[PDB]
Every structure is written in structure tokens, then in C-alpha cells.
Amino acid sequence: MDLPKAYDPKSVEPKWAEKWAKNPFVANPKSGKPPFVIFMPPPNVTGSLHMGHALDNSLQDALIRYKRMRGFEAVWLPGTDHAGIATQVVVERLLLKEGKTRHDLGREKFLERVWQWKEESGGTILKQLKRLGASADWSREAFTMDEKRSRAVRYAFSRYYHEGLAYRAPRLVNWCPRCETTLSDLEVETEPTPGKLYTLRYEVEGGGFIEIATVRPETVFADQAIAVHPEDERYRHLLGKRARIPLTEVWIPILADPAVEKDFGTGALKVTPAHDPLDYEIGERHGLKPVSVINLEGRMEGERVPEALRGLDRFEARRKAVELFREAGHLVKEEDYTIALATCSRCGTPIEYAIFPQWWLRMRPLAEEVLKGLRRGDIAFVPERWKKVNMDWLENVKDWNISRQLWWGHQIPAWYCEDCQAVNVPRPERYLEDPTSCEACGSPRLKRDEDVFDTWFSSALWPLSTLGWPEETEDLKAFYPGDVLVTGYDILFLWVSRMEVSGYHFMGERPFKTVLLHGLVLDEKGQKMSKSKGNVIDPLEMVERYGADALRFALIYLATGGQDIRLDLRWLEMARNFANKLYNAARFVLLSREGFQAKEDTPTLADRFMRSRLSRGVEEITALYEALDLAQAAREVYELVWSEFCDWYLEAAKPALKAGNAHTLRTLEEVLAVLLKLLHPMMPFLTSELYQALTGKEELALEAWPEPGGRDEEAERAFEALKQAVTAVRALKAEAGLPPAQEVRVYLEGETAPVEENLEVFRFLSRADLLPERPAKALVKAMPRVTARMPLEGLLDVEEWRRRQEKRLKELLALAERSQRKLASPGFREKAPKEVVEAEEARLKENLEQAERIREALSQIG
RNA sequence: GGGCGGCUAGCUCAGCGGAAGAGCGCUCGCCUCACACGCGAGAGGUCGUAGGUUCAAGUCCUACGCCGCCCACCA
Ligand SMILES: CC(C)[C@H](N)C(=O)NS(=O)(=O)NC[C@H]1O[C@@H](n2cnc3c(N)ncnc32)[C@H](O)[C@@H]1O
Numbered sequence: 001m002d003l004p005k006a007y008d009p010k011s012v013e014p015k016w017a018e019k020w021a022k023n024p025f026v027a028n029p030k031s032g033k034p035p036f037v038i039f040m041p042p043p044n045v046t047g048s049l050h051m052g053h054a055l056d057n058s059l060q061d062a063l064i065r066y067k068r069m070r071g072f073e074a075v076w077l078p079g080t081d082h083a084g085i086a087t088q089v090v091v092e093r094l095l096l097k098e099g100k101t102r103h104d105l106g107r108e109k110f111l112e113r114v115w116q117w118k119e120e121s122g123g124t125i126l127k128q129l130k131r132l133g134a135s136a137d138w139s140r141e142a143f144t145m146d147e148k149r150s151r152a153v154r155y156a157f158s159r160y161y162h163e164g165l166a167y168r169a170p171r172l173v174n175w176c177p178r179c180e181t182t183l184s185d186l187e188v189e190t191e192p193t194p195g196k197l198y199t200l201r202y203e204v205e206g207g208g209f210i211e212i213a214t215v216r217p218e219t220v221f222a223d224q225a226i227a228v229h230p231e232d233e234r235y236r237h238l239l240g241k242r243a244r245i246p247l248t249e250v251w252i253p254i255l256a257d258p259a260v261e262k263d264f265g266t267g268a269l270k271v272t273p274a275h276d277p278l279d280y281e282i283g284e285r286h287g288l289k290p291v292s293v294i295n296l297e298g299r300m301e302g303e304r305v306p307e308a309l310r311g312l313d314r315f316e317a318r319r320k321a322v323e324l325f326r327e328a329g330h331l332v333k334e335e336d337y338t339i340a341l342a343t344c345s346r347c348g349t350p351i352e353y354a355i356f357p358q359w360w361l362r363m364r365p366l367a368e369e370v371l372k373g374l375r376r377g378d379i380a381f382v383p384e385r386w387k388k389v390n391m392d393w394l395e396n397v398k399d400w401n402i403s404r405q406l407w408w409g410h411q412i413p414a415w416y417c418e419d420c421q422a423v424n425v426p427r428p429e430r431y432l433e434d435p436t437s438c439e440a441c442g443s444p445r446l447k448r449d450e451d452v453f454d455t456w457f458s459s460a461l462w463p464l465s466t467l468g469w470p471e472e473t474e475d476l477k478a479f480y481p482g483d484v485l486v487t488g489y490d491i492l493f494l495w496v497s498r499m500e501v502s503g504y505h506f507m508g509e510r511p512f513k514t515v516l517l518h519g520l521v522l523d524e525k526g527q528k529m530s531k532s533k534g535n536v537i538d539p540l541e542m543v544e545r546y547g548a549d550a551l552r553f554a555l556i557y558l559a560t561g562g563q564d565i566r567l568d569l570r571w572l573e574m575a576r577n578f579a580n581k582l583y584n585a586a587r588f589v590l591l592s593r594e595g596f597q598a599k600e601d602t603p604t605l606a607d608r609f610m611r612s613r614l615s616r617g618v619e620e621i622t623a624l625y626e627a628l629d630l631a632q633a634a635r636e637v638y639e640l641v642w643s644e645f646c647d648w649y650l651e652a653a654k655p656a657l658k659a660g661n662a663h664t665l666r667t668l669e670e671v672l673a674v675l676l677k678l679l680h681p682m683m684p685f686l687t688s689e690l691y692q693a694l695t696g697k698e699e700l701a702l703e704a705w706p707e708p709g710g711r712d713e714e715a716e717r718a719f720e721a722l723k724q725a726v727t728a729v730r731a732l733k734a735e736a737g738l739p740p741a742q743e744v745r746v747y748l749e750g751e752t753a754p755v756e757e758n759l760e761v762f763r764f765l766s767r768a769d770l771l772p773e774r775p776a777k778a779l780v781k782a783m784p785r786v787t788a789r790m791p792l793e794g795l796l797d798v799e800e801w802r803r804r805q806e807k808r809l810k811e812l813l814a815l816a817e818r819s820q821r822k823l824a825s826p827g828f829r830e831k832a833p834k835e836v837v838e839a840e841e842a843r844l845k846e847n848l849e850q851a852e853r854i855r856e857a858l859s860q861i862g
Numbered sequence: 863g864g865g866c867g868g869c870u871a872g873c874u875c876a877g878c879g880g881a882a883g884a885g886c887g888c889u890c891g892c893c894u895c896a897c898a899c900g901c902g903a904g905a906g907g908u909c910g911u912a913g914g915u916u917c918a919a920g921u922c923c924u925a926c927g928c929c930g931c932c933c934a935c936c937a
Contacts, residue, residue, distance in 0.1 A: 588896035
């Protein structure tokens with residue numbers, strides 16, 4: 001230890017960070033010690049980490065460390081996620097911001113550049129976590145696209161397919177013509193945008209009219225019906241007729257359908273299954289054959305599409321499309337409108353739609369496999385309000401498109417016969433085998449799906465792929481049901497649920513026993529922190545400015561009840577300042593036991609007090625950790641250390657130390673140990689440095705959690721008496737306008753036994769000598785247990801003392817009033833505890849007694 | 863259209879059935895021999911509104927008001 005005046009994290013953290021980095025806390029399946037498991041949610045290989053991740057891992061670490069030194073086999077599986085779609089976009093940008101882009105350089109040369117990036121980003125992420133003191137079993141670091149994990153998916157898919165659950169068809173898919181790939185619902189964002197709602201109208205067979213309101217005019221040529229609510233009899237004479245479509249000679253039918261909202265536009269809508277999910281739905285509800293007018297490049301093409309209108313852009317197609325309507329006479333009324341325009345969550349461009357042969361996953365069945373558990377009580381949720389939010393999600397699931405036309409992810413394991421057009425999917429038993437002949441036509445010619453999987457598809461395979469489940473390892477046997485899943489609600493759907501499936505379906509058991517959902521950190525502005533918003537702060541920018549133990553402490557302190565966390569640097573100071581206080585407290589004890597000269601070993605009230613107040617602390621804090629309420633523990637230990645140890649105990653001990661008392665110097669050292677223990681999970685660095693200098697131990701992390709010792713009833717009540725006498729006096733001086741160090745005489749009445757037995761402490765703390773005889777005239781301070789009288793010697797600020805006391809009375813009678821009203825209240829007398837009632841009575845007893853002392857003094861004073 | 867979270871001291875946030883709290887800021891004193899990233903003494907809240915339950919309500923029930931999320935096929 002190098003005990004300077006102020007604590008410099010930079011002289012401590014880095015050396016320990018490295019010591020822990022180079023020598024991980026490796027897990028042992030045969031440790032024959034109760035395990036505790038946590039799967040770290042793998043950070044996306046896109047850039048660095050931000051304060052969010054920090055909150056996330058900081059919480060995890062604190063649990064790992066606690067559990068570890070609590071007696072378990074702390075297993076925290078680290079790892080990074082390839083991000084798929086994400087990383088893709090990221091590397092593309094780096095490229096273009098150079099000159100060339102994706103297509104510009106093959107599917108190889110590019111797939112290369114992405115890995116180089118996977119290294120930078122994946123590497124940086126690891127440092128960051130190491131520097132934040134992550135005691136993660138880096139021996140088992142995993143990576144979504146490493147051999148051991150790529151096997152987890154490939155097998156997972158195989159079992160799915162050959163099980164039926166994973167199929168291939170042409171359901172409708174949300175497609176982004178930017179990235180050229182299908183997305184999933186959860187992957188697209190519908191952000192309200194100003195547009196135009198056009199009402200077109202056209203010829204009915206025999207009769208003459210039908211009117212429709214569509215945001216996209218171009219999608220008319222691909223119509224297959226006009227839908228009208230079932231009960232909207234305003235169309236009763238149009239129901240079942242026809243409709244030449246504008247510019248066409250195509251005659252669409254007029255059908256009913258519950259999905260038509262009569263009150264929107266005209267009571268009827270156009271139906272275009274090949275270009276929209278609502279129409280596709282209604283479409284395939286009256287069996288309407290799909291038909292497209294625009295291709296994946298987002299351009300015009302099709303049978304219906306009219307000459308000269310086929311070709312150019314999807315939008316530059318509706319402009320000229322409208323003019324050909326009104327000027328042709330079918331465009332009735334156009335008008336502004338705020339449309340719920342769907343865009344690609346990761347590139348912005350508005351998604352299109354298309355029927356494509358893709359890989360889907362019968363979610364309906366799986367989802368229930370999970371609900372079975374939740375329903376039973378298998379999984380626990382911390383905020384707990386998320387149980388429902390989860391279940392209700394699974395309640396209404398929709399077959400998930402697993403395919404992706406991206407160049408990143410896992411090349412799916414499916415082979416297509418260039419002859420009988422059949423799919424060849426390796427079986428479980430030989431999942432690793434690449435078919436060489438079609439099991440349909442027996443042909444040798446085969447072609448493998450060039451698609452890729454959804455990053456979210458592999459990620460749902462984590463509580464398994466980190467334990468080598470592609471196979472059947474010992475890790476997976478020793479610790480599969482994870483103990484607590486830490487993550488922020490932002491991915492409770494695309495991860496937590498997805499994983500609950502893999503777990504209940506591939507293992508028939510909860511992937512984890514408790515799901516811990518913490519809020520999200522967000523810029524001061526109140527909005528979420530994320531690479532996308534461009535509102536991110538590197539955790540290392542903060543660590544270098546306040547220190548890792550600080551950053552860790554802020555973040556935990558603030559993570560209360562799964563609530564979000566608004567960025568407020570003030571909280572980072574809060575933390576730093578506290579580290580420093582903890583530090584100083586330690587410096588004092590270290591510098592104290594310096595050249596100490598033992599001269600007695602006498603138990604001191606102050607000692608017996610802090611020991612007791614400590615058990616109280618250990619008990620409380622443990623239970624808090626036991627309830628996964630770290631944020632609370634954080635402020636409960638702040639309390640202990642600062643307000644009970646530094647503010648009162650250390651001070652109360654200085655005289656005894658000058659007096660060369662060993663029992664005290666001892667107690668200080670012992671109490672400081674336990675405290676360093678308690679604080680460790682949150683502030684690991686400083687807490688270790690200190691503990692080593694204090695006891696020689698080089699790995700506090702491995703020490704055992706403290707157990708509450710005794711608890712001294714009287715002692716605690718005795719020392720409170722003291723605290724009061726001391727504060728009374730220093731409150732008097734304050735009011736009198738007397739300087740702090742000013743020598744002073746005082747007289748005490750009441751529970752004074754404590755002050756008498758521990759004179760020197762009283763003196764040292766109040767800076768006052770005790771008067772044997774009560775002074776006639778004097779300034780008075782009335783405290784609950786004790787009362788203080790200060791002689792009128794010197795120049796005192798009576799106006800102040802007056803005001804202050806004229807104000808305590810204004811309050812003591814007020815308190816007496818409330819109590820009276822209670823005690824004499826209907827029902828309160830007996831309908832309340834035989835305790836809260838007799839005590840609320842002992843409040844009245846003394847609120848008066850004090851009000852009296854003050855009243856008398858207050859008036860007595862000339 | 864549904865759900866949810868928030869609304870407590872100037873600011874940022876805890877508390878969530880029995881006498882209103884923290885950090886910072888502010889006022890007054892202090893370089894008191896661990897700490898000025900500090901010490902001591904104070905000021906500052908009818909706990910978003912309207913009801914209701916209960917001996918007892920920021921703390922529970924009920925509508926509502928704003929701020930923000932998530933989910934949904936109003937073309
Ligand atoms: C499979 C998933 C783990 C995926 N690779 C992924 O979620 N990758 S990530 O970079 O977004 N990291 C997400 C994890 O970090 C948390 N997180 C991300 N942003 C924040 C934030 N602003 N506040 C609090 N927590 C946040 C998520 O809870 C998740 O654990």
C-alpha cells in the first residue's frame with residue numbers, strides 16, 4: 001500500500017485487472033461444491049461497449065462474486081455475439097467510408113473484412129469487461145460463430161427440421177431492398193410518417209360504382225378482391241359483384257371479411273395478398289391467389305402492371321400511377337394522412353413485402369412447450385411484472401422466419417437436388433454429415449442453401465452452446481439450469497423467450513431458474529443509450545474519470561427495482577467520493593496500527609457498539625443480496641461505512657488509540673475486514689488492494705462471506721445516548737455562534753451514564769468539559785434521552801439559540817397534537833397493535849417533557 | 863386499440879400500511895492530527911388530480927391528468 005492523501009484508482013485497478021485477466025477464476029464441474037450459473041448476454045461485435053453493458057455486467061459480476069465468496073462454484077460464461085444483420089451493416093459503413101462496398105468485393109473478400117472486424121470489436125469488448133473487473137471464466141469464453149457454437153445451431157436446426165417444427169414454404173416475408181435480406185417482425189420498426197391516402201373508384205359489373213382508399217396506388221394492378229365488412233349493408237348491392245380495376249380489364253370480386261373496418265375510408269378496402277400482410281391474411285381466407293406487381297429490387301413488373309408503367313422505381317411508380325388515374329378519371333379524393341410506415345430497424349429504408357420460399361419455425365407448438373413450465377412456476381421474474389409480459393408474448397406467437405439472405409451468419413445446413421428439386425437435411429445422429437446424394441432421386445448433384453440464420457436463432461441457443469450441448473458434456477451436466485439470467489427487458493422477446501424455447505424443447509427443462517430484468521441506462525435526455533441513437537458513452541471514459549469501482553457502484557446503486565437509469569454524472573461523483581472515503585477510513589486504520597504502542601486491552605463502549613452495529617449490517621446486507629436487491633444493499637453499505645464507521649466509530653476510537661488501547665485498534669482492523677468483504681462484490685478493485693494491505697491476503701475474492709456475529713442490545717442504546725449528548729453540545733455551539741474547536745463547559749441531565757464512563761470520547765467529540773453543578777442561567781438543548789445546559793460565559797448568539805428553540809417547541813407541540821388525535825381516535829386504541837399503540841403513547845409522554853424543558857429555558861432566558 | 867413504467871425536497875432518485883429520506887445544490891461554522899473527493903449545524907416536500915377502502919395511505923382500490931415505452935393488419 002502507498003497511502004497518499006487521496007485515492008488514485010489508476011494506481012490500483014489496472015494492476016489487479018491484469019492479475020485477474022491473465023489468471024481467470026476457472027470453473028470446475030467436479031468441484032463438488034454447489035454451483036451458481038450465469039450466462040452472460042454476449043455483446044454484439046459492433047464497436048465497443050457502452051454504459052449499458054456496464055450496468056448489465058456490473059450487476060452480474062456482483063452476483064458472481066457474492067455467490068463465490070458465499071460458498072458456491074461461480075460459473076459466469078462470457079462470450080461475444082456475431083450480431084449477424086448488425087455487424088453486417090457496420091462493416092459495410094466502414095467500407096463505403098473508404099470507397100468500396102459489399103458487392104464491390106466478392107462474397108469472400110468481404111466475408112474476410114468482417115472477421116478482421118470481429119477481432120477488433122470482439123477484442124476491445126474483452127478488455128473493457130476485464131478492466132471493469134469482470135471475474136468471468138475467460139477459459140470458457142464463447143463466440144456465436146466459433147466451431148463449438150456453429151455446431152450447436154447446425155444440430156439444433158437438424159433436430160427441428162426432421163422433427164417437423166422447422167419447415168420451408170412461401171409464407172409472406174418483410175424484405176429490405178437495402179441490405180437485400182428478409183427480417184422478422186421484432187426486427188422491423190413502424191414509425192409514423194406523413195403521406196397521402198388516395199380514394200380510387202372503379203367500374204362494377206353491370207352497375208357502376210365501388211370506391212377504395214389505399215396508401216399505395218401501384219399495388220392496385222395486383223388486386224384480387226375488394227373487401228367489405230360482413231354487416232356493412234351500405235354495400236349490400238355491391239356485395240358479390242365485380243370491378244374492372246383502373247386501367248385494367250381484370251375483374252376482381254367483391255367479398256365480405258371481418259378485417260374490413262367499415263368506418264375507415266369508404267366501408268371497403270382493396271386486397272393485395274402479394275404485397276401486404278393484411279391482404280395476404282384476408283386473401284388466404286377466401287383463397288385468393290397471390291400476384292405481384294413489384295419485384296425485390298422494388299420495381300414494377302407483372303402481368304397486370306400496365307405498359308409504360310412497368311419498370312421504374314416503386315414510388316416513382318405511384319406518382320405516374322396517380323396521374324394515369326385522375327386524368328383517366330378514377331381518382332376521386334386524395335388527402336394527407338399519417339401512415340404507420342414500416343422501416344428496416346437496422347438501416348432505415350421502408351420494408352417491402354414478398355412471397356418467397358423461406359425457412360420457418362412452427363412457433364405455435366414450441367411456444368406452448370414453454371408456457372407449460374411458466375404456468376407451473378418453473379421460472380421466476382424479479383420485477384415479476386414481466387412474467388405476464390413474457391407469457392402473453394408466447395400466447396400469440398407467429399411462425400418465425402429463420403432464413404436470411406445475409407453474408408454473415410451460419411450458412412444453413414440444407415441441400416437441394418438440382419434434379420428432383422428436393423431438400424436434403426442432415427439427420428440428428430449424423431448432423432455433422434454433408435449429404436452427397438439426394439435421398440429422393442438418389443442423384444449426386446446437390447446444392448446447399450446459400451442463406452444464413454437469424455442471429456437471434458443462434459442466440460436462443462446459449463444456455464446450451466456454452467456448455468457444449470451440440471454434444472452432451474459434463475459442464476452441461478453439472479450446471480445447465482442457469483441460476484439467474486441477467487439482462488435488460490429490451491431483449492425479453494428476441495432473446496429470453498427464444499432461449500426459453502430451446503431450453504424447454506431441447507432439454508425439457510427451464511434454461512434458468514430466475515430471470516433478472518434490469519432497466520436501461522439512457523442519455524440525460526431520457527432516451528435509451530444505443531449505438532443507433534448515437535447517444536453512447538464508453539464505460540472506460542468514465543472509469544478513467546472516476547474509476548471502475550465508482551462506475552460499478554453508481555450503476556448498481558441506481559439499478560433499483562428494474563427501473564431505468566438516467567445518466568447523471570452527479571451519481572458518478574457520489575460513487576468516487578465514497579470510494580475515497582472508504583479508502584481514507586482504511587488509511588486511518590493502517591497509519592494507526594503503524595507504530596502503535598499497546599498499553600492496555602480494555603473493552604470500550606464504542607467498540608462493543610460498532611461490533612453490534614456490524615452484525616446488524618451483515619445480516620441486513622446479506623438478505624438484500626439474497627433478494628437480488630443489489631441497488632438497495634449498495635446504499636445500505638454506504639450507510640454502514642460512512643455514517644456508522646467513519647462518522648462515529650473511527651472518531652470515538654481516536655482517544656482510545658492515543659491512550660494506546662489494543663482492544664480498539666483490534667476492533668477497527670477486524671470491522672474493516674468484514675466491511676471490505678461486504679463492499680467487494682460492488683467495488684472489487686479498491687476493496688482488494690485495501691484488504692491485502694490490511695491482512696496480507698492476496699485474493700479477497702476467494703475469502704468467505706462474513707457471518708453476523710453478535711448484537712449488543714444495551715450497548716447500542718448506550719452509545720445512542722452518547723451520540724445525543726455529543727450532538728446536543730455541538731448543536732449548542734453551532735447556534736451560539738461559537739467556533740468549532742472552541743473550549744466549552746456543559747452540564748448534562750438524563751441518561752448521562754454513557755458520557756461519564758467514556759469522558760475523553762465525549763470531550764474529544766463535543767470539545768466540552770463536564771460541569772458538576774447545574775448552571776442557573778444557561779442555553780438549553782433538549783434531546784430525547786439527554787438534556788444539555790451551557791453556562792452564559794462569553795459572547796453567545798442568543799437570538800439564534802432563541803429562534804432555533806422557539807422553533808423546536810413549535811414542533812414538539814405539533815407532534816403532541818398528532819399523537820393526542822391518534823390515542824383519542826375511534827378504533828385506533830384497540831384495532832391497532834398492542835405495540836404501535838402503547839408506543840405512540842410514549843411519544844406523547846416525552847414530546848411534552850421536552851417541549852417543557854425548552855419552554856422553560858426559552859422563557860427563563862432574558 | 864390494447865398493456866406497462868413514471869409523476870416525493872430546487873435537481874437526479876430511493877421509500878411503497880404505521881411519526882416524510884438520500885446524493886448534489888443551497889445557508890451558517892470549520893484546513894479539528896484518515897479524508898475539502900472533507901467535518902459539524904441547518905433550510906427546503908398538504909409525496910400529479912378527484913374520489914374510495916382501512917384504526918392507519920406517498921404506501922391499497924377506483925377513475926383522470928400529463929411524460930415515456932412495448933404490443934397491434936385502421937388499407
Ligand atoms: C443475444 C443478445 C445477448 C445480443 N447479442 C445482444 O443483445 N447484444 S447487445 O450488444 O445489445 N447487449 C445487450 C445486452 O446488453 C444490455 N443492454 C443494452 N443496452 C442497454 C441499456 N441502455 N441499458 C441497460 N442494459 C442494456 C441488454 O439488456 C443485453 O443484456
